[PDB]
C-alpha cells in the first residue's frame, strides 16, 4: 500500500518553504490575489458564456413564441 518513495526519479531540484506559523494566512489580497482572480475570469468567459448565452436566447424565444401562440388572432373572427 506504500506509494511514497517508489514514485519517480527526480534530480537536482531544490525547494524552500516556510512554517505556516511563520507566514501569512492569506497574503496580498489586492497586490496579487484579486488581480489574478480576474485574469482567470477574463481568459475563460469567452469559451463559457457564448453557448450559455446561446441557450438563454433560445429559452426566451421558445417561451415567448409559445405564449404568443396562445393569444388569439382577430383575422379568424373578423368574418
Amino acid at each position: 500500500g506504500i506509494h511514497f518513495g517508489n514514485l519517480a526519479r527526480v534530480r537536482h531540484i531544490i525547494t524552500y518553504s516556510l512554517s505556516p506559523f511563520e507566514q501569512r494566512a492569506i497574503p496580498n489580497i489586492f497586490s496579487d490575489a484579486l488581480p489574478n482572480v480576474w485574469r482567470r475570469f477574463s481568459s475563460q468567459v469567452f469559451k463559457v458564456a457564448p453557448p450559455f448565452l446561446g441557450a438563454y436566447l433560445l429559452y426566451s424565444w421558445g417561451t415567448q413564441e409559445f405564449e404568443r401562440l396562445k393569444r388569439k388572432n382577430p383575422a379568424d373572427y373578423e368574418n
Partner: peptide, 12 residues
C-alpha cells in the same frame, strides 16, 4: 531563527 525546510533532491 525561522521554522522552515530546504530540500535538495537527487534520487541518484
Amino acid at each position: 531563527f525561522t521554522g522552515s525546510e530546504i530540500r535538495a533532491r537527487d534520487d541518484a
